[PDB]
Every structure is written in structure tokens, then in C-alpha cells.
Symmetry: D2
Subunit: 472 residues, 4 copies
């Protein structure tokens, strides 16, 4: 429903409380560090109004059209529709934008369908879902706790906790270490870390406008690099930004509270509501798109330099193909095996999604490595468009050709491969893939604990009956 | 349709021309090296008559019942039925029997449905399919060419070639290096290696009874070890055997010829007919069953020795779970994306099956390693059931307990884990998984060449338009 | 000093209390399961009297000649001499015999040189060293504790503990899970597992003749396979055997007690005495020899089948070469950086030896994999010498040739490659390399804790001074 | 001998013909993109005059003092001295400067000692060595050939070739794709790629001042990022730069020609002269220093966030320790096994150096990965020193602490870890380690071909005699 113009106007009128290198960012839509991603998100919103993609990206309901990521799926076909929307948006940025709002709309959609889970705060959840849906707003998630130097009563508000409760709502103080893509209208403070018994003061779930007084987003090093599409094909447009989120006695209205002082409710929220399943559904579609981009670049690089005649290179590209097919397989099974949860919400299969989200963090570094191995040293000496336009341009056109590519074309392609792997932007993507869904160690331990291993244990026990029978 | 008794009687009456350590095997049904696998195959046939599995393992047609692996699938549901049959049979032997006849029935079924591919030999193919189906016979595939010492006119019949053609059929001479599970009624001489231009004399496809004069199967080292289910839980029953296949001027009746002197027809047979797709479908179901067995053993081992409290061990088991889910995903997508080929035969998706068959050979050695890492040195000092039954039995019961298992139970379980990984039988399984479908290097190069990489290359080319536009 | 004949006579006269499949082994020198390794150890002893190797394998002292592994090294040259002896013995069996007595003589030699460490039991240690040296006896180490099923006062003697102390010595009861190469005159009960506070009853170190009443060695599955050098080139001669060691109220004379009820002394024994350093020195020489054998086989296999023309194969062999050089490097630095410990005993560098023993367990599975990848399916269908000698021999000679090898030669070579990797014997070698020195997880944690990381931390702290200076 | 001031004055007076983004660089000593590395190289030169390091970094000869990397070693002690100098210089920049001039001085030193190899150009080589030594100049190597688009007589001067020969010297035209650290007085055009028969026009070896008319160095993307030591601890000072090198009818005086039109001489130059051995000696010392830096950072990171209590983290740090010890071992053996080559030049052992240079390219990506795994998401949201100095500084000091570190200290450390791995500078280091010495595929094939595998093949042949004897 939202247009790119509406999104841009919203951030310009009520900008997120962003700070960059010790200074407040007055207008992120024009600031050199953020204007690129803002334009990109704006383009994602505009695509919703392109007739060619209207049916893929939006659905009609009572005379209004809403983004597909808000659709509460009733059938497997509806799930497929949500998946197609995730994929189309992902493809626009070669799967490089990892925290586009549809992944969180998936979470809020599930929370709302499973609103009974929240008890007294159920209506708050349903109303918030309707607000985000109707206004088609952008969201960001603030997660991870700070640490305290115990080498130095103690301050109980380092991590975000409730200072007090009033007739208007709750006052919170503390910080969240990470919020990716802060160019949003709203920030969600939902649990991503297990809470131990006694941590009620920190067991909260709520949402706030990003301009809320007392709320501050502190940026890390900008990885944009430049505006030239030739020199910085990806960083010039898909640099989402990561930030520290500070809560200085922030007032959270009661209407925006979803969970308050309940350890168990927080710990089981994502799984019980189905938010885990739906957000992971967006993720598998996203990573399929990302892998497709790497396959395309690898294939073009190999052909462009005539390296495709080498068995070694063909094998590496085939390896990327195997991984692409693995991700497509997880995506297909996630949808085909979907079943309704305790609240009647159809959710994609967790086994398939757990497989995808626990395997891709291992596959990605290898996919990145493969591109480095194909490009080799050719990725480390790429000139700028300015050099082609300068006095030595003629020399560059004569010396920077590929076995099957003209100079400008080869450099444009290798600059993209470089931006996908070795630029500050590209390297960040690696760290991001390794950890965005959580620490792999914890994720694997979680998978071990939740998985029903009984059918297999029983089959082996049955098979061993003949072994123990020798003693009869 | 066939019963275990009928299969046993068939091999006893007309045994395959098997040789073991320089001597002819008169009765494989009673010989210590082969009676185990014979009994196992017999049990697979008997299961077809168990009312609980009749509908899963067989289908009715004109008053007769045939094995499900012969069913020419018309719908995705039919494909699912074939898959369920592959899985049920596989589960009986923990996915350790890698060349049960249903994988080749899948090949012959596809050949028959796509019989037009064979031209003048089309009816031969259809009739052979009907013969195998009606009699429910067991088959084995003889593949791989011998080498010739060129450090020594030359003998043109080292690999299997046509010596002459007569009114009765063709006379062939040469050898195939491998035939796994030779306890079969028939041997298929189909192409698995690419033929170069000019190799018409070797471009053949035919089938023969395993007792055919001039045909000899020479066995390698027996890996059975013993008959005790406790000491040798798997090798005592699932040792399929591998053999060299010699053709000493063997007469092949014209009715058994499917391809004669046609290089192109041989090279495209498996892909064009859909045999590749259907055989790979049996394989993915089989490997899913195999992975489930490893998961069960790993889980029981960890719990039995209290190692499940270690994060490291939980992580390794979760890794097996990720691989199990990956294989289930490939299997699901293979069926859901199925489409009809040029001959109207519904075939499971090759992308998904290529992913599965090119990934599992890499996953298996790791799955095996994980079991070794969980069992550790505990896998290297396992006593025999005879020691428990001997004078020191009481000591063993007191000293060989697991943190949560009695001695006999722990040893029975570890003996199984050992037989699945470190016994001669278990180690062979590793080599087998690495190469049964082909040399990974060639397989990956084949995947690279057949895969349509254009959609991805086009997306990147489109994305790079903005890069090259800077020069406008 | 000892001859093979003396060793054989010793085991025949006073055989270790060995049990195989519920029965006592009366004469291991003639028993089919043990005669091979007995002959091999005998050959190692005989080599000491070959004039060509006398100076490498023995040293003279006061009119007597002793095995080099007993030499207390005073100079780096002496260390080199010990290394050359380790290497020569290792080479005789292609580095496949992993527990030849010289590795334990290294331990006892260090214990004796550092005898003061043992306090009141110091003379016992010195005298035992002299006994083993003078008689040139063979030893085996019994290690690892049993577990107790807590799913079932408790029996405090599952692991080996002291039941009582008398005027004659101590009475022990319990079991050790592993003893490799039990074809020895003596068994050492030394600590390999960390002891916790309060475990004094189990903190012991002593030695006993293997025929001691109450002592029982229970064998696991025999991996010999056969006596044919062609069919079983390694298992027929280097199958050391592993066994469970039972202590049924065994009396240990006071003269054979080295540590009694001292937790700290046990925990620091190997490191403080230098036994760790010297035993690891034997190990690095041993693994260098083992890697050389794999390199030789891989090279001959590649050349024999003409696979050496493939870049992929050359790369795999070069990988083995890199690992061989790494091990040679660790060995060289271990000797060149040697320094005296607290007791004045020259000990090889622990940093280099810790690197070698923590890296090889990871390199070995890959070296094994490489051989499997070069041999491929050719390793799974190897006939017996009996087939070459049988009626089909002529066919085998014509069909089993290598691109540059005659049939018998290729099969002999591949049978060796198979015995080094896929036979029960070969697969055991893999598990053995992964764990013989300890659980890698514990070994790496031990390395982390003992390593002086301060120099590096200090360099970084110094480098960061400029970073923090920006706030001045 | 040279001081930092002399080096700076030299580049300012006669600057290399550098181009950055289409413009000539007039003064690299003050240009924001190059002043950092210039200052760093200057500091390396100044260290030579610090009394504490004078004996390590320089040697006296006839009243003059020269850089240690010019010393022609006569004894193993001399080799050790060269190694200590390589190490001290490397440590100043945490092993991040990969092309400091001493690695090329090692090449020129070897060329000079083995000058007879060059025939008629021998005196040219000796004189050039003396020139570089006496003036203590900095050098850079221009390598790798361009490609030609054959999808488009042909221009025979794409790669560097001789256009004509005159009484003054030779005129060359073409390009070299890479030259790292162009902030040098001289550029060496030596062979790094195998030349095929008939490529005489391209088989050349010569040296030129970097300001030579017709010579142009074209820079790739600057990776400096910023001058703040806090925000960019490494990129602000060790960004060496990589560039394309253009030769536009450049005149090379005869005195600067070392090899002219000789394919074989070029192909065997590095190996025959010993340049390969000596340059690889600098490399192993360099990588040992680099690994020590990673160990220090990893250790400080783990302790700083209290992650050192996790077994997983301890294991990863121990892994870095194993790799550090491996590199130290290769370095030690390279020196201890040194022998004189055909020209009487003592050269470090190639086996050890081939092991080091072929293993480190595989170890480095893992070492980098380990740092990413320890720092995790904490590496992706690091604020700037400007944020600590800004209005929100107090909040940052309260929320960015480590379990055992104050905020500024933790961020300074993590910023360093980030700059070593994920910044554009850090990621480039990864690609650089993977390929600076050559394509691993070619390097491994070269190792396979040059290594004497006969001793191992012979040992196996001898061992197999017993196998073939069964047929006697
Ligand atoms: Na730029
Ligand atoms: Na047995
Ligand atoms: Na045998
Ligand atoms: Na900056």
C-alpha cells in the first residue's frame, strides 16, 4: 500500500533518532551515509504499485491493498504467495538486503494470528499488527544485551529493563547492542535471548516509533564507500547500517506493550506464535535469491576470463548449484509440509526451516570463498570508472580485457564480485550470514533439544533385539 | 509378487556364475559368504505379502500384484507411492543395502515408458520390463571399464565389445570391473561411462541371466565376518558383495539387446528416458533412511554414555539432523516439481535429485566421522558375546556399563556403531557412498554443463546496466 | 640387547593373561590371532643385532648393549639418535605399529632421569628402568576408566583403586578400558586422565608382569583377516590388538609402586618428568614414517593407473607432501629447541610436539581420504591371490591391469592401499589416530591452558596504545 | 643504512609515476591515500638506526652499514640473522605489510650470489645488487599478464614484450596486472609465470626507477578509510596499495637487463639462483609474525568478553597456537637443513619452505574465521572515537563494556580485530594470503613435479615383495 514517496516523506518529517560519528542525523533521506538504502527501500515500496507485480506484492481486502508480508495465510497457496513476495523483493537487491521489513512483518503477522498467546495484551498485538499493515510501516529489531565489566548497588539497567510502571505505561532503561536497518518508522524490542528464572524485569516485548524521546540509535562505521554504481555497485545502495540502541528512561505507552515481566512467555514467544516459522520462511527465500546472485556472478566471471574451461572452476560453480538446490528444497518442503499450530495459524515446517537456517551460515562463507577463488588476484587491482574516463583510459581499455570481455565490462563485473565479498560491505555480509539468526553453537544446541529423535532411537532399539537375543 | 522362498529356490536351482577365492560357488543360499544377504533379500520379498505393507509395496493390475518399483507413475501421488516403497525397503536394513533391485527396476521402468527412445529395440525393452515385473526378478548392474598396461594387433576386447553378430544375436567379449549384489537372476550391461566418437563396438545395452555360459562373477574379499547378530549386527546380513564380471564369448539373444553400436544413444539413455531421475529418486529415499539410522545410533550412544550433556556432542547430533532434513527436502522437492519428459513419462525433478546425489557423497563421510567422534576409543575395545558367556562374563557386566546402560546393551549398541563405520563392512560403506553414482569430479562437471545458468547470468547483466551507464 | 628368539620364548613360557572370545590364550606365539604381531615385534628386536643398524638401534654401556629408547640423552645429538631409532623401527611396519615398546621406554626413561619427582618411590622408578633396560622387555599401557550405570554402598572399585595396603604391597581392584599391544612382558598402570580432589584411592602409578594372578586382558574382535601377504599385506603382521584390562584383587609388590594416593603427583607426572616430551618425540617420528608410507602408496597408485596426469590427483599427492613436511618440521624443531627440565633432563620442545600431536589427528583422516579418492572404486573389487592361482587366473591377468601395471602388481598394491584404509585393520588405524593421545577436545583445552600467550597479548596491548591516545 | 627521512625525500623528489582515480599523484608522502604507508616504511628504515636493533637489522662492511636483507649468508648463523631481521620488521606492523622491500632484497641478493646463472648479464646483476644495497632502496615487483578479448595483425604487446633493441638498451611495451607497494624507488620486472616455447619476446628480467618515462602505476580502490588510529588501527598505516603497471614504449638501459629473450633462463631463475628459497624464508618469518598477532588479538578478545571460559573458544585459540607452532617449525627446519646450491649460495631448505608457503594460504582463512567466530556480532556495531567524544559518550561508556574491559578498551580492541578481518583492508588481506605467492592449483602441481617421491615409492615396492612372492 505504501509508496516510496510516502516512506521518504515519513523519515524526513519524523526521522529515527540516529547518530553518526558523534552527531545527530537531521535528514537520513539526504545524508550521504543513508540516502542510498533509503532510496532502495523506497524502490521496494514503489514496486508494490507496478501493475506487473501488484498481485505478487499485495492483496486486496475491503477496498484496500496491503503488503503481502501481512497476509495471514489460510492455505498452502497463501504460503506460496508470501514466499513469492519475499523472493521478488529479495531479487531486487541480489539478496543483499538482509533486514527488509517483510521479515518482521512476518513476525508481527504470526503474533497477531496467535494473539491469544499474549493474554491481556492480545488486543494490543492485534491492533499493532493492523497499524503496521494499514500504514505499511517499516520496522527494525533491537536485540542482544550489553556486558558489564566485573573486573572493576550495581546498576540493574544495563540491559533493557523496566524502571517503573505508571498509569500511562512503563518506563524502560538500558541498551540493545544491535539494530540493523534503522531507517524505519518503528523499532521492535522483542526477545532473542533466553531469559533465566528471576529476570522478569527484563522479560519484555514492546514496540516504539523510532523518534521516541530518550531513544538513540548510534551508528557504526559507514560502509557505503561511494555513490558510483560502477565503483560501488552494492554498497552505494544496499548499506543497511547497524547500530547500538540506547534507552534513556523511555516511556512505552500501555497500548504498545505485548509482554510484561513474564520469563516463560518471552522464551516461548517466537515458537508458540509461529513467528519463528514465518520469519525463517522469508529467510530461506532471501538466501535462495542471494545464492542465485552468486551463481550468476561466478558463471559470468568464469566465462568472462575463459576460466570456465577449467574443470576446477566448473566444479566450484556446480558446488554453488548444489547449495542453491538445497535451499530451494528446504523452501519447497517448508511450504508443502505446513500445518496449523496451537492457535490455528498455518506455519511452514520447522524441520525444513531449521535445516535451512542452520546450514546456510556454513554454506555462505564457502560460496564467498568460491567467488574469491575464481576471481583470484584479478579482484585486488580494479581501477575506478574515473581511470577509464581519465588520460590513461585508452591504455586501460587495451590492457584490462577478459578472455571474452571488453575492459569496462570485465571491471564492472569484477567490481560487483569484489563488493559482494571483499569490500567492507561485502565482508560484513559474511559476518552477518554467520550470526544474524543467532550464535551457531546455541542454534545447534536448540535444534538438538527440540527435535524429536525418538522414532530413530526406537528403530535402532528394535534392530538391536536380535543382538541381545543371543543371550537367551 | 515374488516370495522369499521363490527367490531362494531360483538362486539354488540356477545360481549366478559366482566364484569365490578361486572356486565356483555351487549354492549361494547356503554358502557362508552369501547366505546372509540372500536371506535379507528374501525377507524384502516376503514383506510384500505382509498385509500391513501390501499396499505400500505392491499394486494390483488385472488380477495380479506387482512390486511398486515397477509402477509407471502417472501422477505425483504415484511418485509418492514409489518413494514410500523405496523407503520401507530401505528401512529394513538401516539404509545399508545400497543396490537392492528396486533401484534398477526404476531404470527399467523408465526405459520401458520411454521405449520409443530405443527405436527398433523398443519392443525388446517393453518385453524385458514385463518379464522382470511379472516374475519379480532381481537384477545387478555390471559397470566400469578395465585398463590396459601400455608400458608393456592389440586385443580390442578388454572392455565389453561385440565380437560378431549372428542370426541368433551378438557375441560379446571383455569385462566390467564392478557388479554389486550379484545374488540376482539378471545382470544389466548398461552404460555408465561416456563413449567417445568411434566406440560403436562398445556402445551397447543388454541384459542376461546370471547363469549364462561364459559369464563369470569374481568376488572380492568377503566382509561378513561372522553370523552372530551381536558381534556383527550388519555384516552378518547386509554384505551385498562386489565382483569383477567376465564375458568369455557370451551369446546375447537379439531379444535381450536394447542398444547396439550407437554412441549417442548410449550417452543419452539415462537422461532421455528418465531412468536417471527415477533411480536417483530411490537413492534419495535410501540415503534418508541411512541418515535416520545414523541419527538413531548417535542419539542412543550419546545418551547411553551420558555424553549428551556435552554441548559438543549435541552439536554433532544436530549436524546429523540438518543433513537428514536436507535429504528429506530434496526428496520432497523432487516429487513436488515432477514433470513429464519427452516421452510422456512423469519424472522427479533433476535439480533436486542432482543436489541430493552430489551432496550426500560429501555428507556421508562426515556423518561417519561424527559417530566415531561420539563413540571414541569406546569403539575399539568391544568384546564378543562369547566373552559375556564365558568365565569372565561377570567381570564384563560389572566393568562395561555405560553411564545409563547395562554392559550387554552398551556393547550391542557400540558393536552396531562399529559395524556401521569401522568394520571392513562399515568402511566399505564409506567408499561406496563416495563413488557408487560416479566419480564426484565427473559428476560435478556434468552438473555444471547440464544446468541452465542463464537466468542468473541475465539477472546480473541487468544489474550491471547501471554500472556501465556511468560512461554515457 | 634382546633378540627376537628371547622375546618369543618369554611369551611362550610366561604368556600374558590373554582371553579371546571367552577362552584363555595358551600360546600367543602360535595362536592365529596373535602370531603375526609377535613375529613382527620379534623382527624389531632382531634388527638390533644387524650390524647395519646396531649403532642406530643400540648403545654400549659397560660392556653391555641396550636399546636406544632407553638412552638418557645428554645432548641434542643424543636426542637425534633416539629419533633415528624411533624412525628406523617405525619404517619396518610403514608406521602402522602405533604402540611399539620404545614409546613407553621413552616414558620410563624420563621417569627415571626425573626420579626425584617420585620422592620415596624414586629408587623404585630407577630400579624398574634398569630392569626394563637390562632385560629389554616389552611394555603396554592400561588406560581409561569404566563407567557406571546410574540409571540402575556403591562399589568403589570399578576404576582401578587400592583395596588395602599390606607389608608386601598394595591390593588393587577395578578395570582399565584399553591396553593396546598386550603381547608384552609388562603392563604399566600410569595416569592418562586428570584426577579430581578426593580421588586419592585411584591416584596410583605402578607396573606388573602381564602374567600376574588376578590380571586379565580381554580381546576385542580380531582384525588379522588372513595370513596371506598378498591378500592382507598389513593385517597379517601388524595387528597389535586392543583389550579390556581386569584387576581382580591383584597384589602389587611395594618395589613396583611409583605413585601412591597422590592426586597432584599423578596429574603432573608426565609433564614434570618429561615423559610427555619424549613419548611425543617417538610419536612425531612414527607419524612421519606413516605419512611417508601413504605418500609412497599414493604415488605408486597414481602412476600405476595413469591418474598422475590429472591435476586433481597431483594436487592431492602434493597435499600429502605438505603434511609430511609439516611433521618433519615439528620433529626438527622439537630437537633443535630442546632444553633441560627441572630435573636436568634434556627434553624436546613441547611447543613443537604439542603442534604435531594436535595437528596429526586432523591430518590423518584426510590422508586416508586422499588414498580413497585416488583408488576410488578400484579399491572395492580386489580379488584374492587364490583367484589368480585358480582357473580364471588368465582372465584376471588380462582384465585387471593398470595403465602402467600388470594385474598381479596392481592388485598387490591396491590390496595394500585397501589394508591401509578400508579393511577392518585400516579403518581401526583411523580411529586410533584420532584418539590414541587423548580426546582432541581435552587436548586442545589443555594446550590453551598451558601455552604462554602473554608475549602476544603484550604486543597487541602495545599496538593499541595509539588507539587509546586519541582520547588524550 | 637508509633513514626514514632519506626515503621520504626520495619519493617527494622523484615520485613513482602513480595515478589515483584518473589523476597523477604529485606527492605520495602527503597524499591522504599514501602518506600512511610511506610513514610506515620510513619507520622501518629508522628502526635500523635504533641502537637496540642496529645489530639485528644491519651489518657492517668496510666502514659502511647495510640492511640485513642484503647479507649474502655463508653460515646457518647468517641465515638465522636474516630471519631475525625479517621477523623484527614484520612485528612492527603485526605481519600485515606483505611486500616490504626485504622480501625482494632477498631475491636480488640470491640473484647476485648466483650471478653466473645470468651469463653475459651477470655483472649487470651484481652491480644492481650493489646499487640497491648501497643506497638501501625500496623495490616493488610487477607481475601477471593481461588477457585479450578473443570474442572481438593482432597487437603482440599486451603482455610486456621487447619492441626493439638499440645501442642504448631495449624498448618494451605492454602491461603487468599487479604491483603491490608501489611507494618504491625501483620496480622489478621478473618472471612469475611459466613461459612456453616461442615466447622469447616476453622472456625478460630487468629493473627500472619508478619514475621512468612511459611507466605508469594505476591504483585500485583506496582502503585506508581514515587516519584515526582508534577507528582504523591498521588501514591508517599499513595500506600498501596494488596497481596496474603500464609500459608505454619504455626504454630499459642495457645495464638494467638481467635476462633477454631466454625462455629457459626465465623459467628456472628463481629456483636455480635460490631466490625462491630466500624470499620464502622472509615469507615464513612474516606469516609467523602475522599468526602471533592473531593469537594475541584472539586471546585478548576472549578474555575481554569472558568468552575464555567456553571450551569452544579455548579450542579455537589452541587451533591458532597449533598453526603458529607449525609455521615456527617450518622456519626452524628451513634454516637447520640449509645447504649450498649449484652456485655456492647457502639456501634454506625448499621442502620446509614449500610446506609453509603451500599450507599457510589454507590456514589463514581459518585463522581469520576464528577471529570472526570469537568476536561474533560484537564486531559489526563498533562506534567511532567521535561517538565516545560526543554527547552520548557517557552512555557508550556505560553500555559498551566487556565482561573484563572498559568501553574504550573493548572498542579499540574490537576495532583492531575488525580491521584485521572485515574492513576492506582486512578482507583484502585474506585474498592476498590466498594468492600472493601464486595460484594454489599451480603451486601444488609444481610441488608434485619437483618433489623427489622415489624414496617412498621404493619403500613400498620393497614392502610388496612379500605380496608377489606368494606366486613363486
Ligand atoms: Na570509492
Ligand atoms: Na567375529
Ligand atoms: Na581374506
Ligand atoms: Na572511518
Amino acid at each position: 500500500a505504501r509508496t516510496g514517496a510516502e516512506y521518504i516523506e515519513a523519515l524526513k518529517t519524523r526521522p529515527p533518532n540516529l547518530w553518526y560519528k558523534g552527531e545527530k542525523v537531521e535528514d537520513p533521506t539526504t545524508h550521504p551515509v543513508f540516502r542510498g538504502i533509503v532510496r532502495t527501500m523506497a524502490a521496494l515500496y514503489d514496486l508494490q504499485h507496478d501493475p506487473r507485480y501488484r498481485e505478487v506484492l499485495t492483496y486486496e481486502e475491503e477496498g484496500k491493498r496491503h503488503g503481502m508480508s501481512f497476509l495471514i495465510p489460510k492455505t498452502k497457496e497463501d504460503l506460496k504467495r508470501r514466499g513469492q513476495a519475499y523472493k521478488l523483493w529479495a531479487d531486487q537487491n541480489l539478496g543483499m538486503m538482509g533486514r527488509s521489513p517483510d521479515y518482521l512483518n512476518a513476525v508481527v503477522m504470526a503474533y497477531a494470528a496467535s494473539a491469544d498467546y499474549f493474554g491481556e495484551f492480545a488486543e494490543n498485538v492485534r491492533n499493532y499488527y493492523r497499524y503496521l499493515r494499514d500504514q505499511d510501516l517499516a520496522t527494525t529489531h533491537a536485540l542482544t544485551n550489553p556486558q558489564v565489566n566485573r573486573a572493576r548497588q550495581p546498576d540493574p539497567y544495563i540491559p533493557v529493563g523496566v524502571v517503573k510502571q505508571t498509569e500511562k505505561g512503563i518506563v524502560v532503561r538500558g541498551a540493545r547492542m544491535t539494530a540493523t536497518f534503522p531507517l524505519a518508522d518503528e523499532v521492535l524490542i522483542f526477545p532473542s535471548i533466553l531469559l533465566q528464572a528471576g529476570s522478569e524485569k527484563y522479560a519484555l516485548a514492546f514496540a516504539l516509533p523510532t523518534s521516541t524521546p530518550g531513544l538513540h540509535f548510534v551508528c557504526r562505521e559507514a560502509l557505503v564507500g561511494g555513490d558510483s554504481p560502477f565503483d560501488h555497485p552494492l554498497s552505494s545502495r544496499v548499506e543497511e547500517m547497524d547500530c547500538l540502541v540506547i534507552f534513556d528512561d523511555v516511556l512505552v505507552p500501555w497500548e504498545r506493550v505485548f509482554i510484561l515481566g513474564n520469563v516463560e512467555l518471552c522464551n516461548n514467544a517466537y515458537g508458540a506464535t509461529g513467528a519463528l516459522n514465518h520469519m525463517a520462511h522469508q529467510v530461506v527465500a532471501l538466501k535462495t535469491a542471494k545464492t542465485e546472485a552468486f551463481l550468476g556472478v561466478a558463471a559470468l566471471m568464469a566465462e568472462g576470463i575463459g576460466a570456465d574451461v577449467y574443470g576446477h572452476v566448473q566444479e566450484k560453480i556446480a558446488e554453488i548449484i548444489v547449495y542453491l538446490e538445497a535451499m530451494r528444497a528446504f523452501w519447497t518442503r517448508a511450504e508443502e509440509e505446513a500445518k496449523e499450530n496451537a492457535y490455528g495459524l498455518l506455519v511452514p515446517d520447522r524441520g525444513a526451516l531449521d535445516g535451512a537456517r542452520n546450514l546456510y551460515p556454513r554454506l555462505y562463507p564457502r560460496i564467498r570463498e568460491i567467488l574469491e577463488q575464481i576471481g583470484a588476484s584479478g579482484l585486488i587491482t580494479l581501477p575506478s570508472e574515473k581511470d577509464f574516463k581519465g588520460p590513461l583510459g585508452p591504455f586501460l581499455e587495451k590492457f584490462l580485457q577478459g578472455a571474452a570481455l571488453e575492459a569496462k565490462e570485465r571491471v564492472a563485473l569484477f567490481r560487483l564480485a569484489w563488493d559482494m565479498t571483499l569490500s567492507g560491505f561485502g565482508a560484513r555480509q559474511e559476518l552477518y550470514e554467520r550470526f544474524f539468526f543467532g550464535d551457531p553453537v546455541r542454534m545447534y544446541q536448540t535444534l538438538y533439544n527440540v527435535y524429536n529423535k525418538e522414532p530413530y532411537k526406537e528403530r535402532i532399539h528394535a534392530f538391536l533385539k536380535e543382538s541381545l537375543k543371543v543371550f537367551e
